[PDB]
Amino acid sequence: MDIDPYKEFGSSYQLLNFLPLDFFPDLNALVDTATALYEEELTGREHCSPHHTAIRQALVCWDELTKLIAWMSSNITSEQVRTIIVNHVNDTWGLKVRQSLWFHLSCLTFGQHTVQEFLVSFGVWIRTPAPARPPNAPILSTLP
Amino acid sequence: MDIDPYKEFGSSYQLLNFLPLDFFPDLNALVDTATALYEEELTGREHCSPHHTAIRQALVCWDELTKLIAWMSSNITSEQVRTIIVNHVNDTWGLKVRQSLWFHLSCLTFGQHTVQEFLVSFGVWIRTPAPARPPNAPILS
């Protein structure tokens, strides 16, 4: 199936992918934010919100990934080849986990609607030709 | 952070890990079932249920894994070290994806309380010693 994990959240993948890669905080910061703001809720017994569910699924996935690269690291793969695997991972999969954590943590903190409206505004802006294009990007708050 | 993706669903990794590995259907089978029974809901605009959110997340995760295996397969890795890797993620990561798909698809078609009670009954079963232990496992109905 063709599944966009942002579609049930009123956004889309291509909208997340318009933003510059440096826009999203690094992963460690996002986990620190998630821990500090929602640790009890995410490790709790209740759904809380589909955003919480997305966060836990994404962190669980990322955990499987780090255990995989740890396994092939200590078990099979040499040093340099390990570092190119890890660098490809962080340049791809890690970006996607950061996009997810940023999206859902931002929805929980500032409201899903204002995040949706930000992403849509940014899409409009990046899609506008330079003659008609306003100088300044749409903006949205940043997380702790 | 220490997260059990089943605790939000009133269950437990530990209960899933009691079941034998061959109990969960092949992943192609679970994906076929999710496609046939839930394609339009899963690929839609609405959450539908936490089970749907979990299934889309699980399959998106598995997709990222297949693309990683593809990349390091054709770029980095010899055929035999590749198959060792594919064996590892199949017996580990893949088993876990099958566990997630089976759990949530089972909740959707058969009820969440039904699946919960099944897992707790199976836990009780696998836990009781052979003298007092009934001969036939709990079923899911």
Swiss-Prot record, chain A:
Report keywords, A-Z.
Answer: Disulfide bond, Host nucleus, Host-virus interaction, Repeat, Secreted, Signal, Viral immunoevasion
Q: Where in the cell is it found?
A: Secreted; Host nucleus
> How is the polypeptide modified once translated?
Phosphorylated.
Q: Which GO terms of type biological process are on file?
A: microtubule-dependent intracellular transport of viral material towards nucleus; symbiont entry into host cell; viral penetration into host nucleus
Name any one GO molecular function: structural molecule activity
Origin: domain of life: Viruses
Q: Name one GO cellular component term.
A: host cell cytoplasm
Q: Which family does it belong to?
A: Belongs to the orthohepadnavirus precore antigen family.
Write out the function statement from the record: May regulate immune response to the intracellular capsid in acting as a T-cell tolerogen, by having an immunoregulatory effect which prevents destruction of infected cells by cytotoxic T-cells. This immune regulation may predispose to chronicity during perinatal infections and prevent severe liver injury during adult infections.
Assembly: Homodimerizes.
This one is known as External core antigen
| Lineage of source species | Viruses, Riboviria, Pararnavirae, Artverviricota, Revtraviricetes
Query: Entire protein: which part is shown?
Result: 31 to 174 of 218
